[PDB]
C-alpha cells in the first residue's frame, strides 16, 4: 500500500514515487532481495520525483538536528506539501517512526510507514545513491556526509575555537623558526657588509642594530656631520659608536663593493628587519592567546614557558592527563620549571600539572585559581 517514499540526503531531500509494490508476502525470499541490490530491478520499483537541495551548510545542520530529534523543518514541510496529494489517505514511507507523528501533525492526510517493507526500499534508495537521481545535481554524497559529520558531531559537544590550543604549538614552532632565520640571515648581513666595512661589524655587536645602521650607512665614504647626528640618533651615543663609526669610516681597509652588491645587502637586511618585526608581533599574539586559552598555566609560570610545556605534551589535553611526575620530566630537558632547588621544581611541577587541568576542562577558564595557585608557590618559596 506504499506510494510515496521520503529519502533524505546531505545534498538535499529526495521524495520518490513507488510505481510497483514489491511482493510483501515474499519479502525474505532471496530473489526479491537480489532485486534490491540490482539497479535495473530497483528502478522498476521506484523513480525519483523531487529533489530540493538545501540552501547551504547552515541550513543542513539545522535540519540534521531536527531530523535527529524527529522534527519537521520548514524546508521539510515545503517539499512534502508540494508533492503529497491532499486526497483515502496518501501513504508515505519514512525511515523513522519518531518522525511519523510529526508529519501526521503537519499533514493530517498522510499516513506514514516504517515497516520492514519501507526499510527495504530505504536501504535500496541509499544503496544506489546518486545513480537514482538520473544526473540531478546532488553534489557528492560521500564528501557532503563528512562535512555534516564534523558539523553535526561538534554541535552537541559545544567545542569551540576558544578550546582550540594548537595555535600555541604553531606559534612556538614558528617563533623559534623565526629566531633561527633572523639570526642566520643576520650573520650573513655582517659578512656581506663586512667586506665593505669590516670594522663596523665589531662596533655594533647587536645584529638587529647593525642591520639598521647598514641601511643608512650604505657607503662608508658618505660621512657628514648631519649624518653623524642621524646615526647618533640610532641607539645612543653612550657607547660612543657614533663617533667610532665616523672615525672608522674615514679610515678603513674595507674594499668597496659594487652598486648591485650594495643593493642586495640593504634589501636582504630589510628582509631580516621584517622577520624580527613579525616575530615581535607573533610573540604578542602568543602572549594574548594563552591568557584566553590557558590563563592558569600562563599566570602560574609565564606565557612562553607554558606554551613550550604544552607543545611537549602535544596538546593541552595531553598535558592535563599526565600525572604530576611525568609533567616534571616533560620540561626537564630544557629546564622549564627550574636539593632544595629540586624540591621547588617538583612542587611547582605538581602545581603546573594542576593549572593545566583548570585550563583544559573549563569552557571559559579564568585566572582566579591560577593566581591563588601561584601565591601558594610563592609562599613555599620563602619557607625554603
Amino acid at each position: 500500500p506504499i506510494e510515496y517514499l521520503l529519502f533524505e540526503e546531505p545534498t538535499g531531500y529526495a521524495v520518490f514515487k513507488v510505481k510497483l509494490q514489491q511482493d510483501d508476502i515474499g519479502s525474505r525470499l532471496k530473489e526479491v532481495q537480489e532485486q534490491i541490490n540490482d539497479f535495473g530491478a530497483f528502478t522498476k520499483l521506484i523513480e525519483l520525483v523531487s529533489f530540493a537541495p538545501f540552501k547551504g551548510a547552515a541550513e543542513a545542520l539545522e535540519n540534521a538536528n531536527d531530523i535527529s530529534e524527529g522534527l519537521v523543518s520548514e524546508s521539510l514541510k515545503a517539499i512534502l506539501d508540494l508533492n503529497l496529494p491532499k486526497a483515502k489517505n496518501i501513504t508515505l514511507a519514512i525511515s523513522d517512526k519518531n518522525l511519523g507523528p510529526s508529519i501526521k501533525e503537519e499533514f493530517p492526510y498522510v499516513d506514514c510507514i516504517s515497516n520492514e517493507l519501507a526499510q527495504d526500499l530505504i536501504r535500496g534508495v541509499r544503496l544506489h545513491g546518486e545513480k537514482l537521481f538520473k544526473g540531478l545535481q546532488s553534489g557528492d554524497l560521500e564528501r557532503a556526509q563528512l562535512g555534516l559529520g564534523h558539523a553535526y558531531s561538534r554541535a552537541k559537544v559545544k567545542f569551540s575555537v576558544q578550546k582550540n590550543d594548537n595555535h600555541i604549538i604553531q606559534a612556538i614552532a614558528l617563533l623559534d623558526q623565526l629566531d633561527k632565520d633572523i639570526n642566520t640571515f643576520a650573520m650573513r648581513v655582517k659578512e656581506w657588509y663586512g667586506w665593505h666595512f669590516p670594522e663596523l661589524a665589531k662596533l655594533v655587536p647587536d645584529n638587529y642594530t647593525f642591520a639598521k645602521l647598514v641601511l643608512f650607512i650604505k657607503d662608508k665614504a658618505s660621512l657628514n656631520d648631519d649624518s653623524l647626528h642621524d646615526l647618533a640618533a640610532l641607539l645612543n651615543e653612550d657607547s660612543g659608536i657614533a663617533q667610532r663609526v665616523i672615525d672608522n669610516a674615514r679610515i678603513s681597509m674595507g674594499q668597496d663593493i659594487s652598486e648591485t652588491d650594495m643593493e642586495n645587502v640593504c634589501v636582504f637586511a630589510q628582509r631580516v628587519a621584517s622577520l624580527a618585526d613579525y616575530r615581535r608581533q607573533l610573540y604578542d599574539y602568543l602572549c594574548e592567546k594563552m591568557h584566553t586559552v590557558a590563563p592558569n598555566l600562563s599566570e602560574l609560570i609565564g606565557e612562553v614557558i607554558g606554551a613550550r610545556l604544552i607543545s611537549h605534551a602535544g596538546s593541552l589535553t595531553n598535558l592535563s592527563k599526565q600525572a604530576a611526575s611525568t609533567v616534571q620530566i616533560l620540561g626537564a630537558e630544557k629546564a622549564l620549571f627550574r636539593k632544595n632547588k629540586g624540591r621547588i621544581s617538583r612542587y611547582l611541577a605538581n602545581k603546573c600539572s594542576m593549572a593545566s587541568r583548570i585550563d583544559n576542562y573549563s569552557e571559559e577558564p579564568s585566572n582566579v585559581f591560577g593566581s591563588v595557585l601561584k601565591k601558594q608557590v610563592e609562599q613555599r618559596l620563602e619557607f625554603y
Binding site: 514541510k77 506539501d81 508540494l82 508533492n83 503529497l84 496529494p85 491532499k86
Partner: peptide, 28 residues
C-alpha cells in the same frame, strides 16, 4: 494530485500567506 497552482493546505502555512490574506480580507 498536488499542484502549485491551487493551494491544498487550506490554511496559511507561512507568515507571508497570513499577511497577504489579511489585506485580501480587509480589502473586500
Amino acid at each position: 494530485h498536488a499542484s502549485a497552482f491551487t493551494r491544498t493546505q487550506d490554511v496559511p502555512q507561512t507568515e507571508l500567506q497570513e499577511k497577504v490574506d489579511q489585506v485580501l480580507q480587509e480589502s473586500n
